[PDB]
mmCIF file of C-alpha atoms and ligand atoms in Angstrom:
data_model
loop_
_atom_site.group_PDB
_atom_site.id
_atom_site.type_symbol
_atom_site.label_atom_id
_atom_site.label_comp_id
_atom_site.label_asym_id
_atom_site.label_seq_id
_atom_site.Cartn_x
_atom_site.Cartn_y
_atom_site.Cartn_z
ATOM 1 C CA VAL B 5 2.313 -45.014 58.685
ATOM 2 C CA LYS B 6 5.889 -44.057 57.035
ATOM 3 C CA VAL B 7 5.904 -42.175 53.927
ATOM 4 C CA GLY B 8 9.319 -42.185 52.108
ATOM 5 C CA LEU B 9 10.607 -40.472 48.864
ATOM 6 C CA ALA B 10 11.107 -43.075 46.176
ATOM 7 C CA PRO B 11 14.502 -43.344 44.221
ATOM 8 C CA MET B 12 14.349 -41.331 41.084
ATOM 9 C CA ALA B 13 17.404 -41.439 38.325
ATOM 10 C CA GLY B 14 18.247 -37.741 37.709
ATOM 11 C CA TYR B 15 16.068 -35.999 40.434
ATOM 12 C CA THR B 16 16.439 -37.840 43.991
ATOM 13 C CA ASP B 17 19.909 -36.750 44.697
ATOM 14 C CA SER B 18 21.130 -35.637 48.013
ATOM 15 C CA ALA B 19 19.792 -31.970 47.728
ATOM 16 C CA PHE B 20 16.577 -33.163 46.790
ATOM 17 C CA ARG B 21 16.218 -36.114 49.732
ATOM 18 C CA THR B 22 17.656 -33.579 52.172
ATOM 19 C CA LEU B 23 15.049 -31.198 51.236
ATOM 20 C CA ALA B 24 12.317 -33.975 51.565
ATOM 21 C CA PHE B 25 13.698 -34.780 55.144
ATOM 22 C CA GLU B 26 13.322 -30.938 55.671
ATOM 23 C CA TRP B 27 9.610 -31.442 54.887
ATOM 24 C CA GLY B 28 8.885 -34.849 56.813
ATOM 25 C CA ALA B 29 9.499 -37.627 54.736
ATOM 26 C CA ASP B 30 10.447 -40.713 56.704
ATOM 27 C CA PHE B 31 13.398 -42.334 54.092
ATOM 28 C CA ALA B 32 14.370 -42.078 50.867
ATOM 29 C CA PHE B 33 16.766 -43.969 48.096
ATOM 30 C CA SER B 34 19.939 -43.261 46.391
ATOM 31 C CA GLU B 35 19.387 -42.917 42.407
ATOM 32 C CA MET B 36 19.843 -46.639 41.126
ATOM 33 C CA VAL B 37 23.386 -47.694 41.370
ATOM 34 C CA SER B 38 24.883 -50.078 38.596
ATOM 35 C CA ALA B 39 26.689 -52.649 40.430
ATOM 36 C CA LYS B 40 28.646 -53.206 37.622
ATOM 37 C CA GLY B 41 29.591 -49.702 37.321
ATOM 38 C CA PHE B 42 30.330 -49.769 41.202
ATOM 39 C CA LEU B 43 32.774 -52.706 40.919
ATOM 40 C CA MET B 44 34.382 -51.061 37.986
ATOM 41 C CA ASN B 45 34.827 -47.803 40.259
ATOM 42 C CA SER B 46 32.958 -45.653 37.827
ATOM 43 C CA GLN B 47 33.055 -41.690 38.438
ATOM 44 C CA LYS B 48 29.101 -41.694 37.796
ATOM 45 C CA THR B 49 28.306 -44.326 39.883
ATOM 46 C CA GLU B 50 30.504 -42.965 42.770
ATOM 47 C CA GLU B 51 28.894 -39.733 42.548
ATOM 48 C CA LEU B 52 25.245 -41.143 43.282
ATOM 49 C CA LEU B 53 26.252 -42.856 46.552
ATOM 50 C CA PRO B 54 24.852 -41.292 49.608
ATOM 51 C CA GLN B 55 27.336 -40.271 52.224
ATOM 52 C CA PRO B 56 27.277 -42.932 55.032
ATOM 53 C CA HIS B 57 26.437 -40.731 57.626
ATOM 54 C CA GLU B 58 23.124 -39.841 55.491
ATOM 55 C CA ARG B 59 20.687 -41.427 57.623
ATOM 56 C CA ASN B 60 17.471 -43.289 56.696
ATOM 57 C CA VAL B 61 18.356 -43.665 52.879
ATOM 58 C CA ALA B 62 18.959 -46.867 51.038
ATOM 59 C CA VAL B 63 21.735 -47.391 48.458
ATOM 60 C CA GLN B 64 19.725 -49.362 45.654
ATOM 61 C CA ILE B 65 21.541 -51.128 43.434
ATOM 62 C CA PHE B 66 20.669 -52.730 39.965
ATOM 63 C CA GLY B 67 22.051 -55.449 37.640
ATOM 64 C CA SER B 68 21.030 -58.712 36.015
ATOM 65 C CA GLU B 69 23.882 -61.109 37.213
ATOM 66 C CA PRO B 70 24.119 -62.470 40.806
ATOM 67 C CA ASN B 71 27.646 -62.594 41.027
ATOM 68 C CA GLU B 72 27.791 -58.618 40.394
ATOM 69 C CA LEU B 73 24.717 -57.725 42.639
ATOM 70 C CA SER B 74 26.306 -59.981 45.410
ATOM 71 C CA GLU B 75 29.990 -58.341 45.177
ATOM 72 C CA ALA B 76 28.734 -54.989 45.251
ATOM 73 C CA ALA B 77 26.148 -55.580 48.014
ATOM 74 C CA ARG B 78 29.266 -57.046 50.265
ATOM 75 C CA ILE B 79 31.481 -54.251 49.513
ATOM 76 C CA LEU B 80 28.855 -51.485 50.377
ATOM 77 C CA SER B 81 27.895 -53.467 53.378
ATOM 78 C CA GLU B 82 30.959 -52.586 54.962
ATOM 79 C CA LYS B 83 29.679 -48.868 55.045
ATOM 80 C CA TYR B 84 26.183 -48.666 54.386
ATOM 81 C CA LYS B 85 23.346 -50.622 56.806
ATOM 82 C CA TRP B 86 20.507 -50.623 54.131
ATOM 83 C CA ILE B 87 20.778 -51.947 50.565
ATOM 84 C CA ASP B 88 17.822 -52.139 48.471
ATOM 85 C CA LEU B 89 17.507 -54.256 45.017
ATOM 86 C CA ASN B 90 15.955 -52.471 41.989
ATOM 87 C CA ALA B 91 13.566 -55.451 40.573
ATOM 88 C CA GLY B 92 11.040 -53.140 38.964
ATOM 89 C CA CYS B 93 12.462 -50.594 36.516
ATOM 90 C CA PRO B 94 10.664 -50.562 32.809
ATOM 91 C CA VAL B 95 13.373 -48.346 31.408
ATOM 92 C CA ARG B 96 14.315 -49.873 27.870
ATOM 93 C CA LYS B 97 18.142 -49.686 28.573
ATOM 94 C CA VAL B 98 17.654 -51.039 31.650
ATOM 95 C CA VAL B 99 15.389 -54.096 30.755
ATOM 96 C CA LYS B 100 17.503 -54.913 27.554
ATOM 97 C CA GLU B 101 20.641 -55.646 30.023
ATOM 98 C CA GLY B 102 18.205 -58.046 31.893
ATOM 99 C CA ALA B 103 18.321 -55.661 34.860
ATOM 100 C CA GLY B 104 15.587 -53.887 36.509
ATOM 101 C CA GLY B 105 12.087 -55.437 36.016
ATOM 102 C CA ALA B 106 13.335 -58.022 33.497
ATOM 103 C CA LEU B 107 14.391 -59.512 37.048
ATOM 104 C CA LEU B 108 10.852 -60.761 37.048
ATOM 105 C CA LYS B 109 10.506 -62.592 33.474
ATOM 106 C CA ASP B 110 11.993 -65.365 35.421
ATOM 107 C CA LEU B 111 11.047 -65.810 38.842
ATOM 108 C CA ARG B 112 13.367 -68.917 39.606
ATOM 109 C CA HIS B 113 16.159 -66.804 38.398
ATOM 110 C CA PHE B 114 14.762 -63.759 40.688
ATOM 111 C CA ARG B 115 14.500 -66.374 43.721
ATOM 112 C CA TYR B 116 18.318 -67.290 42.993
ATOM 113 C CA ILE B 117 19.437 -63.611 42.991
ATOM 114 C CA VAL B 118 17.500 -62.603 46.252
ATOM 115 C CA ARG B 119 18.682 -65.777 47.886
ATOM 116 C CA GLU B 120 22.502 -64.524 47.231
ATOM 117 C CA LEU B 121 21.901 -60.870 47.603
ATOM 118 C CA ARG B 122 20.445 -62.081 51.096
ATOM 119 C CA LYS B 123 23.816 -63.729 51.869
ATOM 120 C CA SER B 124 25.616 -60.633 50.954
ATOM 121 C CA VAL B 125 23.987 -57.862 52.525
ATOM 122 C CA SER B 126 25.031 -57.674 56.108
ATOM 123 C CA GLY B 127 22.199 -54.817 57.419
ATOM 124 C CA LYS B 128 18.813 -54.205 55.787
ATOM 125 C CA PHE B 129 17.936 -55.657 52.759
ATOM 126 C CA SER B 130 15.078 -54.334 50.762
ATOM 127 C CA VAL B 131 13.469 -55.264 47.207
ATOM 128 C CA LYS B 132 11.538 -52.366 44.897
ATOM 129 C CA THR B 133 9.784 -54.457 42.247
ATOM 130 C CA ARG B 134 6.385 -54.166 40.751
ATOM 131 C CA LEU B 135 3.615 -56.774 40.121
ATOM 132 C CA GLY B 136 5.095 -58.986 37.714
ATOM 133 C CA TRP B 137 6.476 -58.799 34.104
ATOM 134 C CA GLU B 138 3.486 -58.749 32.066
ATOM 135 C CA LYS B 139 0.838 -60.194 34.379
ATOM 136 C CA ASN B 140 0.109 -59.872 38.053
ATOM 137 C CA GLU B 141 2.055 -62.350 39.947
ATOM 138 C CA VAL B 142 2.572 -60.349 43.152
ATOM 139 C CA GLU B 143 1.687 -63.157 45.398
ATOM 140 C CA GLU B 144 4.506 -65.533 44.088
ATOM 141 C CA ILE B 145 7.266 -62.540 44.391
ATOM 142 C CA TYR B 146 6.259 -61.661 47.475
ATOM 143 C CA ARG B 147 6.430 -65.207 49.195
ATOM 144 C CA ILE B 148 9.854 -65.485 47.210
ATOM 145 C CA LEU B 149 10.977 -62.245 49.311
ATOM 146 C CA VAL B 150 9.554 -63.126 52.574
ATOM 147 C CA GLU B 151 10.783 -66.796 52.188
ATOM 148 C CA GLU B 152 14.394 -65.595 51.281
ATOM 149 C CA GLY B 153 14.581 -63.329 54.200
ATOM 150 C CA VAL B 154 14.212 -59.614 52.670
ATOM 151 C CA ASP B 155 13.285 -57.210 55.338
ATOM 152 C CA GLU B 156 11.265 -54.778 53.464
ATOM 153 C CA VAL B 157 9.243 -54.451 50.185
ATOM 154 C CA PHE B 158 8.053 -51.264 47.962
ATOM 155 C CA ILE B 159 5.950 -52.384 45.329
ATOM 156 C CA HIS B 160 4.875 -49.972 42.478
ATOM 157 C CA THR B 161 1.242 -51.663 41.636
ATOM 158 C CA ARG B 162 1.721 -51.814 37.769
ATOM 159 C CA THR B 163 3.305 -55.158 35.704
ATOM 160 C CA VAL B 164 6.790 -54.204 34.203
ATOM 161 C CA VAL B 165 5.240 -53.911 30.331
ATOM 162 C CA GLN B 166 2.755 -51.451 31.538
ATOM 163 C CA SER B 167 5.681 -49.112 32.273
ATOM 164 C CA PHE B 168 3.523 -45.613 33.051
ATOM 165 C CA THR B 169 0.321 -46.711 31.047
ATOM 166 C CA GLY B 170 -2.752 -48.041 32.819
ATOM 167 C CA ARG B 171 -3.112 -47.283 36.529
ATOM 168 C CA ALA B 172 -1.522 -48.322 39.722
ATOM 169 C CA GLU B 173 -3.810 -50.725 40.869
ATOM 170 C CA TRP B 174 -3.435 -50.405 44.674
ATOM 171 C CA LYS B 175 -5.999 -53.240 45.734
ATOM 172 C CA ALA B 176 -3.593 -55.809 43.860
ATOM 173 C CA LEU B 177 -1.859 -55.711 47.480
ATOM 174 C CA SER B 178 -4.692 -56.522 49.634
ATOM 175 C CA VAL B 179 -4.484 -60.292 49.083
ATOM 176 C CA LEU B 180 -1.062 -60.075 50.392
ATOM 177 C CA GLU B 181 -0.571 -61.135 54.195
ATOM 178 C CA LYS B 182 1.997 -58.378 55.096
ATOM 179 C CA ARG B 183 4.374 -60.632 57.129
ATOM 180 C CA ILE B 184 7.276 -57.854 56.619
ATOM 181 C CA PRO B 185 6.879 -54.088 56.306
ATOM 182 C CA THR B 186 5.148 -53.728 52.790
ATOM 183 C CA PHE B 187 4.737 -50.191 50.995
ATOM 184 C CA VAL B 188 2.755 -49.123 48.335
ATOM 185 C CA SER B 189 3.786 -47.051 45.322
ATOM 186 C CA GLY B 190 2.313 -45.714 42.027
ATOM 187 C CA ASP B 191 -0.131 -42.719 41.373
ATOM 188 C CA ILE B 192 0.417 -40.845 44.266
ATOM 189 C CA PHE B 193 0.222 -37.368 43.458
ATOM 190 C CA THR B 194 -2.155 -36.134 46.650
ATOM 191 C CA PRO B 195 -2.866 -36.692 50.151
ATOM 192 C CA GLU B 196 -6.024 -38.245 49.064
ATOM 193 C CA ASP B 197 -4.342 -40.518 46.700
ATOM 194 C CA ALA B 198 -2.301 -41.406 49.480
ATOM 195 C CA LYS B 199 -4.921 -42.613 51.945
ATOM 196 C CA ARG B 200 -6.802 -44.649 49.252
ATOM 197 C CA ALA B 201 -3.828 -46.314 47.967
ATOM 198 C CA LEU B 202 -3.024 -47.225 51.808
ATOM 199 C CA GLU B 203 -6.639 -48.070 52.280
ATOM 200 C CA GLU B 204 -6.878 -50.378 49.044
ATOM 201 C CA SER B 205 -3.562 -52.369 49.438
ATOM 202 C CA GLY B 206 -3.273 -52.693 53.385
ATOM 203 C CA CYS B 207 0.293 -51.539 53.402
ATOM 204 C CA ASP B 208 2.381 -50.288 56.094
ATOM 205 C CA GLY B 209 3.153 -46.960 54.414
ATOM 206 C CA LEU B 210 3.824 -45.504 50.997
ATOM 207 C CA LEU B 211 6.366 -43.821 48.671
ATOM 208 C CA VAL B 212 6.017 -40.483 46.658
ATOM 209 C CA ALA B 213 7.716 -40.128 43.618
ATOM 210 C CA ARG B 214 6.022 -37.915 40.669
ATOM 211 C CA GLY B 215 4.089 -36.517 42.911
ATOM 212 C CA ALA B 216 7.080 -34.893 45.100
ATOM 213 C CA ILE B 217 8.953 -33.192 42.092
ATOM 214 C CA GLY B 218 9.058 -29.721 42.997
ATOM 215 C CA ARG B 219 6.648 -30.170 45.797
ATOM 216 C CA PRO B 220 8.483 -31.604 49.095
ATOM 217 C CA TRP B 221 5.837 -30.426 51.007
ATOM 218 C CA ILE B 222 3.570 -33.344 49.672
ATOM 219 C CA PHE B 223 5.035 -35.685 52.529
ATOM 220 C CA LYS B 224 3.913 -32.938 55.598
ATOM 221 C CA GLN B 225 0.387 -32.481 53.557
ATOM 222 C CA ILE B 226 0.039 -36.519 53.497
ATOM 223 C CA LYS B 227 0.962 -36.856 57.091
ATOM 224 C CA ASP B 228 -1.489 -33.786 58.031
ATOM 225 C CA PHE B 229 -4.368 -35.392 56.169
ATOM 226 C CA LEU B 230 -3.898 -38.742 57.419
ATOM 227 C CA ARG B 231 -4.071 -37.442 60.908
ATOM 228 C CA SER B 232 -6.355 -34.754 60.853
ATOM 229 C CA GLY B 233 -8.605 -35.000 57.684
ATOM 230 C CA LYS B 234 -7.205 -31.680 56.318
ATOM 231 C CA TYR B 235 -3.976 -30.411 54.792
ATOM 232 C CA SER B 236 -2.913 -26.815 53.436
ATOM 233 C CA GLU B 237 -0.879 -25.707 50.455
ATOM 234 C CA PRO B 238 1.971 -23.644 50.739
ATOM 235 C CA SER B 239 2.289 -19.509 50.277
ATOM 236 C CA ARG B 240 4.213 -18.036 47.291
ATOM 237 C CA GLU B 241 6.730 -17.073 50.134
ATOM 238 C CA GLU B 242 7.050 -20.781 51.310
ATOM 239 C CA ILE B 243 7.402 -21.718 47.424
ATOM 240 C CA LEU B 244 10.392 -18.963 46.850
ATOM 241 C CA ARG B 245 11.894 -20.316 50.408
ATOM 242 C CA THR B 246 11.938 -23.787 49.224
ATOM 243 C CA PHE B 247 13.333 -23.264 46.035
ATOM 244 C CA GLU B 248 15.959 -20.999 47.350
ATOM 245 C CA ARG B 249 16.988 -23.957 49.975
ATOM 246 C CA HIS B 250 16.908 -26.674 47.298
ATOM 247 C CA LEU B 251 19.040 -24.579 45.008
ATOM 248 C CA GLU B 252 21.265 -23.789 47.908
ATOM 249 C CA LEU B 253 21.672 -27.501 48.574
ATOM 250 C CA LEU B 254 22.295 -28.379 44.757
ATOM 251 C CA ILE B 255 25.245 -25.467 45.001
ATOM 252 C CA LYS B 256 26.818 -27.226 47.733
ATOM 253 C CA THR B 257 26.720 -30.845 46.557
ATOM 254 C CA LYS B 258 26.678 -30.304 42.953
ATOM 255 C CA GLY B 259 28.696 -26.975 42.134
ATOM 256 C CA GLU B 260 27.218 -23.897 40.528
ATOM 257 C CA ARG B 261 26.933 -25.024 36.915
ATOM 258 C CA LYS B 262 25.443 -28.428 37.870
ATOM 259 C CA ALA B 263 23.051 -26.869 40.078
ATOM 260 C CA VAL B 264 21.348 -25.030 37.334
ATOM 261 C CA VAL B 265 20.892 -27.777 34.931
ATOM 262 C CA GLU B 266 19.675 -30.084 38.044
ATOM 263 C CA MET B 267 17.038 -27.176 39.244
ATOM 264 C CA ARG B 268 15.628 -27.239 35.774
ATOM 265 C CA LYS B 269 13.663 -30.528 36.074
ATOM 266 C CA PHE B 270 11.980 -29.304 39.148
ATOM 267 C CA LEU B 271 10.797 -25.737 37.807
ATOM 268 C CA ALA B 272 7.336 -26.869 36.541
ATOM 269 C CA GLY B 273 6.703 -28.529 39.699
ATOM 270 C CA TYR B 274 7.853 -25.482 41.985
ATOM 271 C CA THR B 275 5.754 -23.139 39.531
ATOM 272 C CA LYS B 276 2.584 -25.405 39.038
ATOM 273 C CA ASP B 277 -0.685 -23.633 38.946
ATOM 274 C CA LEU B 278 0.988 -20.214 39.075
ATOM 275 C CA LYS B 279 -0.136 -17.179 36.941
ATOM 276 C CA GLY B 280 2.443 -17.086 33.741
ATOM 277 C CA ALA B 281 4.711 -20.163 34.984
ATOM 278 C CA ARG B 282 4.780 -21.165 31.245
ATOM 279 C CA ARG B 283 6.058 -17.945 30.171
ATOM 280 C CA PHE B 284 8.665 -17.891 32.932
ATOM 281 C CA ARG B 285 10.008 -21.338 32.401
ATOM 282 C CA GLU B 286 10.611 -20.315 28.923
ATOM 283 C CA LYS B 287 12.781 -17.642 29.815
ATOM 284 C CA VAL B 288 14.413 -19.352 32.157
ATOM 285 C CA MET B 289 15.284 -22.867 30.720
ATOM 286 C CA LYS B 290 18.604 -21.323 29.044
ATOM 287 C CA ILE B 291 19.950 -19.428 32.027
ATOM 288 C CA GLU B 292 23.169 -20.604 33.228
ATOM 289 C CA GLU B 293 24.308 -18.386 35.792
ATOM 290 C CA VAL B 294 23.112 -19.484 39.232
ATOM 291 C CA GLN B 295 22.697 -16.115 40.487
ATOM 292 C CA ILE B 296 20.370 -15.133 37.420
ATOM 293 C CA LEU B 297 18.356 -18.060 38.007
ATOM 294 C CA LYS B 298 17.986 -17.029 41.380
ATOM 295 C CA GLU B 299 17.023 -13.712 40.813
ATOM 296 C CA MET B 300 14.166 -14.619 38.061
ATOM 297 C CA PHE B 301 12.519 -17.104 40.261
ATOM 298 C CA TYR B 302 12.374 -14.302 43.118
ATOM 299 C CA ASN B 303 11.011 -11.958 40.585
ATOM 300 C CA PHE B 304 8.861 -14.349 39.169
ATOM 301 C CA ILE B 305 7.092 -15.055 42.683
ATOM 302 C CA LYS B 306 7.363 -11.772 44.109
ATOM 303 C CA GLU B 307 5.377 -10.490 41.325
ATOM 304 C CA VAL B 308 3.012 -13.162 41.380
ATOM 305 C CA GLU B 309 2.739 -11.964 45.029
HETATM 306 C C1 LIG T 401 12.295 -39.678 36.537
HETATM 307 C C2 LIG T 401 11.875 -41.187 37.341
HETATM 308 C C3 LIG T 401 13.312 -42.167 37.586
HETATM 309 C C4 LIG T 401 12.905 -43.446 38.298
HETATM 310 N N1 LIG T 401 14.288 -44.111 38.750
HETATM 311 C C5 LIG T 401 13.884 -44.868 39.494
HETATM 312 C C6 LIG T 401 15.158 -45.820 40.001
HETATM 313 O O1 LIG T 401 16.166 -45.217 40.113
HETATM 314 N N2 LIG T 401 14.628 -46.567 41.029
HETATM 315 C C7 LIG T 401 13.507 -47.038 41.473
HETATM 316 O O2 LIG T 401 13.130 -48.270 41.972
HETATM 317 N N3 LIG T 401 12.400 -46.670 40.665
HETATM 318 C C8 LIG T 401 12.834 -45.230 40.041
HETATM 319 N N4 LIG T 401 11.527 -44.818 39.270
HETATM 320 C C9 LIG T 401 9.993 -45.235 40.055
HETATM 321 C C10 LIG T 401 9.416 -44.383 41.098
HETATM 322 O O3 LIG T 401 10.333 -44.939 42.450
HETATM 323 C C11 LIG T 401 7.998 -44.763 41.280
HETATM 324 O O4 LIG T 401 8.010 -46.152 41.784
HETATM 325 C C12 LIG T 401 7.181 -44.795 40.099
HETATM 326 O O5 LIG T 401 7.579 -43.567 39.728
HETATM 327 C C13 LIG T 401 5.708 -44.865 40.528
HETATM 328 O O6 LIG T 401 5.001 -44.009 41.628
HETATM 329 P P1 LIG T 401 4.358 -42.510 41.298
HETATM 330 O O7 LIG T 401 3.511 -43.273 39.963
HETATM 331 O O8 LIG T 401 3.688 -42.079 42.447
HETATM 332 O O9 LIG T 401 5.515 -41.583 40.086
HETATM 333 C C14 LIG T 401 11.830 -43.713 38.904
HETATM 334 C C15 LIG T 401 10.537 -43.074 38.301
HETATM 335 C C16 LIG T 401 10.821 -41.549 37.706
HETATM 336 C C17 LIG T 401 9.354 -40.796 37.110
#
């Protein structure tokens, strides 16, 4: 069973991906990369690309037109060995553009895009998608991917229209004869969720997304649980050290100012269920100096114990 960190725009940058690998994740993905922005040499897209030496990390691209996706894939293939296509995002901005989950609105057009991308991805080509645009059409979507030579598939078990409402219907993948590595995603917050999702879907592995924000040890817990039926929670000292390591990685990769801004997104997760976390978060949300943030987090933990 393989357990990977899902792509999460705004969260899964190189620092968080690295931290996840330091807790046992098997693989990860870049934040979604606009194919058009990449071809335009935009600064924003250039900053999202993984380094070519960064192992086991896909470059996920998004777009609505076959020519931009294929061209971006051909160019990226010169340096990256694994390209993934986002065909699941329900975000309004992305769907309005006809990208992400909007690619599932017309499966004839989806097949066209997948066939053209297959020709342009020299290495491993995967697709991350959903069950369908507005209804479960996963057998057809999966058949397209297998027939067009996709190497691996990641499926968030919700339709695009549901966004994050309703539940991840893990059993929807049980009907699929898994001819290629197939991974389940959706509502995976604990090891118990991970085990049930694997059992109901019949998949080869799973992705952790919201469940890993501020909780990178979830990868080790999931593997511990699947192997032995038991897992443990991190000590307060281990939470502190993880926060410190994450912050150090953020400073190294993005500089002090940006490190503080990015870390703000993970504080709720790191302090989850810690006495007085709400008060602490309120006090640190506007702190701009990285040294002050680090000292307050240290003070908050050592006092909790
Ligand atoms: C903040 C955020 C950003 C996301 N960005 C991406 C993305 O860039 N690419 C992608 O394929 N999915 C993206 N996802 C979807 C996740 O990869 C995942 O499939 C989804 O959250 C369902 O898993 P979960 O319910 O276990 O969190 C995003 C999810 C979140 C919460």
